């Protein structure tokens, strides 16, 4: 009837890719985060920001290419193309590291626009919105690492660059400087990721091994029409199996599939709380009862004090080349070496 | 070491001496458990989304499943039409058997491949090494991200077992 | 040297929430024994 | 007073969800104790 109704009926039309209202936020912003990454890893260097090479023009393969974080002198500037740093020039915008905030900002509005996509399709199909709530897990890892972690730090420079090996140094930068593995929020996150991979490997292998005979063929994939009301696997058998192997087992398909949602997602929320606590440098660095004892008793050694000496090697050896803006000129005689290494 | 801090003594010393992160079999099992926790929470949400009304709003959602029943407890056509619009139509498994097989394939193949990464790196066939790989025409070494990753490996290598070594190369 | 307020953190972090979850189970079984009407309802 | 509330309901917790919630508290007590004692 009205003008709003014609636009509402056009976006929600059955077509190849469902656009909806949320596609106006997703499809422009996701196309430019992805294309900003493919351009930045192919053409744009890191020679002026980090003093590296992170492009395909500079000989890096898929692994050692990245879209890199800007300089520490930029601080937390948004680095707009028209801004006071770039001033409209495209070429000087790329050399300062403007594509990285271009990827991260238009990417953050892609994950907004993709989670709104999951509320919109669920309302048209008419189902409960648990996909949009389980996808809030990965939103809490993008925001609290690519956004909330460099905000608490000195600049955008201490953020993960969007490249394969550039994530890998961020894994190593976070052990030596922060002792991230000791943090109980990672420990509750590893329990959800390795726990979530566990549940789909079991529920994959128990459904597929309690199937009913619905055909004479040896292939069991053929014997399932999608619109049938009979269940395709014996729940009573699978309960009787695991009650004797493992001792305790699900007797509820509604509780089972909810539990496959809770376990992976909670590991992304609990691990997201800790990385917000490392923006503020509130790290779980030491057990002081272990540290006061190892100072007074020069014979008491645990595995825990062995990890601190591994972190002095990370804090001293890479920090010269890690942070060229700070100009660490270490002598050879201050770098902690071991015996004969 | 059978412990918790002993595990991270094991992982870091294994990084300096073998470069596991650049090895493509740790790469094929990070994809196994990131993918595994994806398809876990992606399958577990689409079943819980499409549950059939069998309870009231006062009692629990889970009590609409009586144990050992023969009726199907969720509209599988509903969750197929949702994911058939969330990405596109042809990327959706209408077959629930082939769906519940792909949940068992992806992690297990990812951990078979990974556990034969530790095995082939037990015999000192390490991961990739792209240190000093990018040079200018003059021949000076241009750093990459692998050179920054190398300086993290050199810090752990010169500090692990700080008294056990006597000779310049950690052959063990 | 350990913090002596951590004994109060842990042993009340165990007992107070765990004794809470016991209570919701005991009154659950009492309502089921309450309706059932035999030998235990009273 | 006034009349009885028609919004009285009952709370349930089966034997299954007891052992989840017990094990949830003890494992969080095992995990976070070492940091609290410092």
């Amino acid at each position: 009837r009205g003008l709003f109704d014609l636009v509402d009926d056009w976006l929600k039309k059955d077509r190849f890719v469902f656009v909806g209202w949320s596609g106006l936020l997703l499809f422009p912003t996701a196309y430019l985060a992805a294309g900003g990454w493919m351009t930045g890893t192919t053409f744009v260097t890191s020679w002026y920001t980090h003093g590296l090479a992170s492009s395909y023009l500079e000989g890096c393969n898929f692994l050692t290419a990245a879209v890199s974080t800007p300089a520490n002198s930029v601080g937390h500037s948004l680095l707009l193309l028209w801004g006071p740093e770039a001033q409209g020039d495209f070429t000087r915008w790329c050399q300062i590291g403007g594509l990285w905030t271009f990827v991260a900002l238009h990417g953050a509005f892609g994950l907004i626009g993709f989670c709104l996509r999951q509320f919109e399709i669920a309302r048209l199909v008419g189902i409960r919105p648990y996909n949009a709530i389980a996808f809030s897990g990965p939103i809490a890892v993008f925001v609290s690492v690519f956004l909330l972690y460099p905000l608490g730090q000195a600049s955008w420079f201490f953020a993960p660059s969007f490249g394969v090996a550039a994530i890998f140094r961020f894994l190593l930068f976070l052990q030596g400087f922060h002792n991230w593995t000791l943090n109980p929020f990672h420990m509750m996150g590893v329990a959800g990721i390795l726990g979530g991979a566990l549940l789909c490997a079991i529920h994959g292998a128990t459904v597929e091994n309690t199937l009913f005979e619905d055909g004479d063929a040896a292939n069991t994939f053929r014997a399932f029409t999608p619109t049938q009301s009979e269940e395709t696997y014996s729940m009573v058998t699978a309960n009787r199996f695991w009650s004797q192997i493992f001792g305790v087992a699900f007797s509820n398909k509604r509780w089972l599939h909810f539990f496959m949602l809770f376990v992976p997602v909670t590991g992304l929320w609990t691990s997201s709380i800790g990385i917000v606590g490392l923006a503020l440098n509130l790290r779980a660095y030491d057990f002081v009862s272990q540290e006061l004892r190892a100072a007074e008793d020069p014979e008491f050694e645990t595995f825990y004090t062995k990890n601190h000496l591994l972190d002095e090697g990370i804090r001293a050896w890479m920090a010269a080349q890690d942070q060229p803006h700070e100009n660490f000129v270490f002598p050879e005689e201050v770098l902690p070496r071991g015996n004969a290494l | 070491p059978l412990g918790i801090s002993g595990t991270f003594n094991f992982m870091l010393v294994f990084q300096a001496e073998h470069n596991i992160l650049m090895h493509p079999f740790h790469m094929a099992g990070v994809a196994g458990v990131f993918g595994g926790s994806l398809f876990s929470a992606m399958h577990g949400s689409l079943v819980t989304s499409s549950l059939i009304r069998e309870t009231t709003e006062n009692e629990s959602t889970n009590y609409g499943y009586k144990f050992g029943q023969e009726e199907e407890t969720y509209n599988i056509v509903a969750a197929h039409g949702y994911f058939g619009r969330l990405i596109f139509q042809y990327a959706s498994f209408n077959n629930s058997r082939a769906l519940h097989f792909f949940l068992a394939l992806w992690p297990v193949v990812g951990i078979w491949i990974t556990s034969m990464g530790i095995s082939t790196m037990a015999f000192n066939l390490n991961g990739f090494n792209f240190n000093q790989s990018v040079v200018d025409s003059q021949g000076r070494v241009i750093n990459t991200w692998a050179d920054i990753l190398n300086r993290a490996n050199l810090g752990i290598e010169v500090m692990h077992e700080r008294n056990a070594h006597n000779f310049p190369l950690d052959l063990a | 040297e350990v913090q002596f307020g951590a004994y109060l953190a842990v042993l009340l972090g165990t007992f107070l929430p765990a004794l809470f979850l016991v209570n919701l189970f005991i009154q659950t079984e009492a309502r089921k024994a309450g309706k059932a009407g035999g030998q235990d309802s009273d | 007073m006034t009349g009885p509330n028609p919004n009285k309901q009952a709370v349930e917790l089966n034997r299954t969800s007891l052992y989840w919630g017990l094990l949830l508290i003890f494992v969080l007590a095992v995990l976070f104790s070492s940091y609290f004692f410092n």
């Binding site: - | 144990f67 | 004994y7 842990v10 | 052992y19 017990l22 094990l23 070492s34």
Partner: peptide, 30 residues
């Protein structure tokens, strides 16, 4: 004195594992 708490948390965790396996609410059809 400090390790006495850690031991009580560990064997106390293994108690509720014992009761969950053997005293489980046995599911029944009908």
């Amino acid at each position: 004195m400090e390790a006495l708490v850690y031991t009580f948390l560990l064997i106390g965790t293994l108690m509720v594992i014992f009761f969950a396996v053997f005293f489980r609410e046995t599911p029944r059809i009908l």
